[PDB]
Structure formats: C-alpha cells, structure tokens
Design goal:
homodimer; alpha+beta; SH3 type barrels; endopeptidase fold (from Nostoc punctiforme); six-stranded antiparallel β-sheet; 4 helices; binds chloride ion; binds sodium ion; thiol protease (chains A, B); NLP/P60 protein (chains A, B); protease (chains A, B); Papain-like_cys_pep_sf (chains A, B)
C-alpha cells in the first residue's frame, strides 16, 4: 500500500510506468519506499539506501513485506573504507569469474552495467554509493589520475557528463563491466594507456577523471 | 667482498654453489649480506629483508654496491596491513594480465612461483613475508577455512608440509601461480569447491589450511 517495505526477492525497477527500460534492481533484503503514485499497473518507488527512484510493477507487490525496522544508514570513516577495499576488489574478481554479460540496469548479478557493478561491489561490504555513474562522480572526492590507487573509481564520458565507470587496480589497470558495442559485453580488465588493446584505447580516449570513495551515502530527508 | 650490499639489478640466487636451481630472485634495490664462503665461483649470501639464504654467482658482483644505509625493517600494525590488502590483491591482478609462465624460484616478475607471487605482492606495499610456502604458513596466524577473507593466504600440500600457496579473494576463489603439470602454468584463479573445474579440484584435494598476515617479517639478529 504505502511507506517502507523490504523486498523478499530481487526486484526490477524501471525508468517509467511503461516498464520497458530497467533503471536498477533491488536485491532481496533491501528497503524501498512505496508512494501512492500508480500509473499503468506500476507504482512509483524509491530505494531507501541510495534514494534511487523508479517504477515497480504491481505484480511484484507479493515480494514486498512491510518493514518493521526502518533502514538507518551506517557511517564509515575513511580508514574503515580503506580496510574494506580488498573485499570490494575481490567482489569484482569473483563477478568476473561467473558467466556474465552487460545488462543495462544490472545491479544484482551476475549481469551488471558499469555503475551497477560498482554499487554492488561496494554494497557487498555495506558501503552505499549512488547508482548512476554521474552520481558516483559527484559523490566521490575528485583526485588526479596520478593519485589513483586500488579501489578508486575511474570515470569516462563526454566533456559534459560521466557515462561509464570502473574500479582502479594498479599500474593503469582497472576492472569494469562494458557493453557489446564498444567493450567486452561483461566484466573485464582494461588499461589506461595508449599501449593497450583496441578496447582499452577506446575507453582511454574518453577518460574524464577519477574519484575516491570517502564516505557511504546518507539518504536525504526523505 | 663482505657485509651488506644493495643490488643494482634483479639477481638470481641459487640453492647450491652449482647454481643450477633457482632459490629466489632479489629485485633491484634489495639488500643482501655477502659472506666469505666462496665455492665454485659462487658466494653464499642471504637477503636482508627475509633472511633467505642462497648462492650468488661471482659474475653478479658488478651488480652489487655497498650499502651505506643499513636495512631496518618497518613495523606494520594489523590495521595498517588491512588497509594495504587492496593493493596486494591488485598487484596479483596486474601480474595476471602480463604474459607469464610458472617459474621455479620466480620472484621479480613477470614469471612467478606460488610463494614468489605472494612475497612479491606483499612486498609491493612494503610488507615482507618469508619466501617459501612452508615458512609463510609458519609466519601467518592460522585461521579456519570458514574465516577466510580477502588477502588471507591459502595453503596446500601433504599432511606433513605446505608446498603451495594462494591469495584468497571471495566466495571460495583464490589467485595463485601454478605449474605446468597440475596447474595453469602461471597465474590464474581457482575455487575451493568440488564444483570447480579439474585444476581447482586437484588443488582443493590438497588444501591444508589458511593463514592471516598480521605482521611484517623482522629479520633475525643477524
Ligand atoms: Cl521504462
Ligand atoms: Cl643450485
Ligand atoms: Na594501486
Ligand atoms: Na572476501
């Protein structure tokens, strides 16, 4: 009906009430806020941990249970984050070992989009990033390319906006999920170098910058 | 002649004065202690950071310079170590992206043996482990398999000794360098599961245990 629910299954959230384009996916256990805005047998919701808005099919209501304990965001110090980055990187490596393909809006696995892999990898240790690549760029602390260290985010796009993100490893290498047309159709490793293969070069040409995760996302009120 | 030197090039150290079997390799910059024990146009040495003994060809003396600042081991807290594990894992991933093959005694890269990859990966952040897999098992804090987390070491061997080591990632996966006969002839990823491929199964059958790195090696006196 209305208010805070928790999901009992992985749920697809869409950009619009038409439900033709996936915006994100809400892993079982996550909390969401259900509004009274119904259109086209869908309902407008937002996810509690990242404030991400979308549309849920009304047929997924059987997979919602009312929350009895409200979601309250945990606070991480920069040191706490630093200690968890090994697990974040390991998540991406484990993901790369599964059969996977790029999935627009993919967030629960095994199929991810670029910003969805980042969110999932950080959320596997309880750190919340916003969902979209341009939001991740805005949420992290900008650093120079020279300052990149393992677990920093690398941003790519146009001069106007970030449209792609990856996770830095070492010595120019980074892990990301990339699409069929420009990339690898799933998770792989590229290098920020003109000495890379053709896929690497194509992303290198689009490099915008880099960011460091220094806090976990605290939801707006509300 | 005698005492503490620093190397100007990557140097091969052998098990014996015959110099037919590589024991370790000393990366440029490392310090070593040269003894007066000469045999067969080789000289007995030990490496300062890990106390590892071996034989250096006398023809490598042109790549030694006397040390003017003695090696003094740094101390790392468990927290400091935890913060560097992301870089250690990233090192192994970067290594896996280079053309590489198993190399007995391989320590400087790009070709490693199993315990050599571990030493190199930790040394890339300034943490010193002993060189051999059985020494690594003795130096780490034993943990149960259930307690494994990213950056822990996984040990394999017989009921009597560890003979192989890898670096734990997540959800049973670990990275290691493995030989031609049982393994992958270089760096790859396997799983601690009966659901793995044949290479994974062969190592799983040999699993001894696990260890956590909780300090950096402090050389003996001397
Ligand atoms: Cl839509
Ligand atoms: Cl020898
Ligand atoms: Na790094
Ligand atoms: Na882990």
């Amino acid at each position: 009906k209305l208010g805070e629910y928790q999901c009992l299954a992985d749920l697809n959230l869409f950009d619009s009430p038409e439900c033709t384009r996936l915006a994100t996916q809400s892993a079982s256990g996550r909390h969401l806020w259900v509004t009274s805005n119904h259109q086209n047998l869908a309902v407008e919701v937002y996810l509690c941990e990242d404030d991400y808005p979308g549309w849920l099919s009304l047929s997924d209501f059987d997979s919602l249970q009312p929350a009895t304990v409200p979601y309250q965001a945990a606070t991480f110090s920069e040191s706490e984050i630093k200690k968890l980055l090994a697990e974040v990187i390991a998540f991406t490596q484990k993901a790369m070992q599964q059969s996977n393909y790029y999935l627009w809006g993919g967030t629960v696995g095994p199929n991810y989009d670029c910003s969805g892999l980042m969110q999932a990898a950080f959320a596997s240790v309880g750190i919340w990033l916003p969902r979209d690549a341009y939001q991740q760029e805005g949420f992290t602390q900008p650093i120079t390319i020279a300052e990149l260290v393992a677990g920093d985010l690398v941003f790519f796009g146009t001069s106007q906006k970030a449209t792609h993100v990856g996770l830095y490893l070492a010595d120019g290498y980074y892990i990301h999920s990339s699409g069929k047309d420009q990339g690898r159709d799933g998770i792989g490793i590229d290098i920020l170098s003109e000495q890379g293969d053709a896929v690497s070069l194509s992303y290198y040409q689009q490099l915008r910058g880099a960011g460091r995760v220094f806090k976990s996302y605290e939801p707006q009120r509300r």
